[PDB]
Design a protein around this ligand. Structure first.
Ligand SMILES: CCC(CC)N1CCN(C(=O)c2cc(Cn3c(=O)[nH]c(=O)c4ccccc43)ccc2F)CC1=O
Length: 351
């Protein structure tokens, strides 16, 4: 009938596509036929998180053996995987837990997406306008010659990590973001307000937009989060772009630039999942990397420090294989976040 800007319809179309959701889950080896995503419940997702913590309990307590296999057997029962020919493998490292956490994470935002897309069937509203309404989050496109588009494009290209050399990033569209209740709840008076990157999977963008960026649930095992249950940001565009998991086939992603009020940072050299306890007054955790932009080449876009620049070495040591190659910012309270811009990104793979 009558809708909205053609670039926003293309955004709503991309993120409300459940067919692509049904595929991303099979690439994570989730049996979508045994448990259709339509009949997804927060109770089953909670139950899977609990079983992951059970699995963690056996790992951290050295109780391998059967107690581990009994927990994986429970998790694999309530969260149906599809490896086809072989027995589903055990989960014996934090990498496997942190991978199952993403499955559950994505499986959570798919519940939110299907719930939202299954909402009002109003005859006086084109379907892409109902979804946009149920999002409760403004998405207004910016001119390609606008002040914001120019600095954000430089932010993307100037902070593409040298070690992420398999793709190039091309800004297809820039939307201004405003989630209802985010400005009014923001710690707008805290210092070190920075425009940082965050990237996630496609299925999660109805979640992050309608519900904001969120603290991990209580039922999740804390060993899957290298710095605690917080909202993770990067100052390197490609570091967040990697987390979009853009495919050679599906080479489109969404990057989010948010205002992050960090305040005083509790800078850590090596990951520590109990990092929130080490705050003790400080307002954020800064994962120190060996390569990052420099304070000289920074600018300020509409109130916030934009960490521009080519980026170089930081002098950061702790001789150990977990020396972050690039910096990592964590906040443990959604009030320190204000979603501000959204980028439609085209990944041009080079291999
Ligand atoms: C519970 C709801 C779901 C909804 C999707 N969720 C997930 C948790 N979460 C995070 O921020 C989070 C992200 C990562 C990985 N990581 C990423 O993915 N993108 C990035 O740019 C990024 C940049 C630097 C470092 C890590 C990054 C790890 C742990 C986290 F806690 C907020 C949230 O709301």
């Amino acid at each position: 009938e009558s809708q909205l800007d053609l670039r926003v319809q293309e955004l709503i179309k991309l993120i409300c596509n459940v067919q692509a959701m049904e595929e991303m889950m099979m690439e994570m080896k989730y049996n979508t036929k045994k448990a259709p995503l339509g009949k997804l419940t927060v109770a089953q997702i909670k139950a899977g998180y609990q079983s992951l913590k059970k699995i963690e309990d056996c790992i951290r307590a050295g109780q391998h053996g059967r107690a581990l296999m009994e927990a994986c057997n429970e998790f694999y029962t309530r969260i149906p995987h599809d490896f086809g020919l072989r027995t589903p493998p055990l989960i014996r490292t934090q990498k496997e837990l942190s991978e199952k956490i993403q499955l559950l994470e994505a499986l959570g935002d798919i519940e939110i997406a299907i719930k939202l897309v299954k909402s009002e069937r109003q005859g006086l509203e084109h379907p892409l306008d109902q979804h946009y309404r149920n999002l409760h989050c403004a998405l207004r496109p910016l001119d390609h010659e606008s002040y914001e588009f120019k600095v954000i494009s430089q932010y993307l290209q100037s902070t593409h990590a040298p070690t992420h050399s398999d793709y190039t990033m091309t800004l297809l569209d820039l939307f201004e973001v405003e989630k209802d209740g985010e400005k009014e709840a923001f710690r707008e008076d805290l210092h070190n307000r920075m425009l940082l990157w965050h990237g996630s999977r496609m299925s999660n963008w109805v979640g992050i937009l309608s519900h904001g960026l969120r603290i991990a649930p209580p039922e999740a095992p804390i060993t899957g989060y290298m710095f605690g249950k917080g909202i993770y940001f990067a100052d390197m565009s490609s570091k967040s772009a990697n987390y979009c998991f853009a495919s050679r086939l599906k080479n489109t992603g969404l990057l989010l630039l948010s205002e992050v009020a960090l305040g005083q940072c509790n800078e850590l050299l090596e990951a520590n999942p109990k990092a929130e306890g080490l705050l003790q007054g400080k307002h954020s955790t800064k994962g120190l990397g060996k390569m990052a932009p420099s304070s000289a080449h920074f600018v300020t876009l509409n109130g916030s420090t934009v960490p521009l620049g080519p980026a170089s070495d930081t002098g950061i040591l702790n001789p150990d294989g977990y020396t972050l190659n690039y910096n990592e910012y964590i906040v443990y309270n959604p009030n320190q976040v204000r979603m501000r811009y959204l980028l439609k990104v085209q990944f041009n793979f080079l291999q």
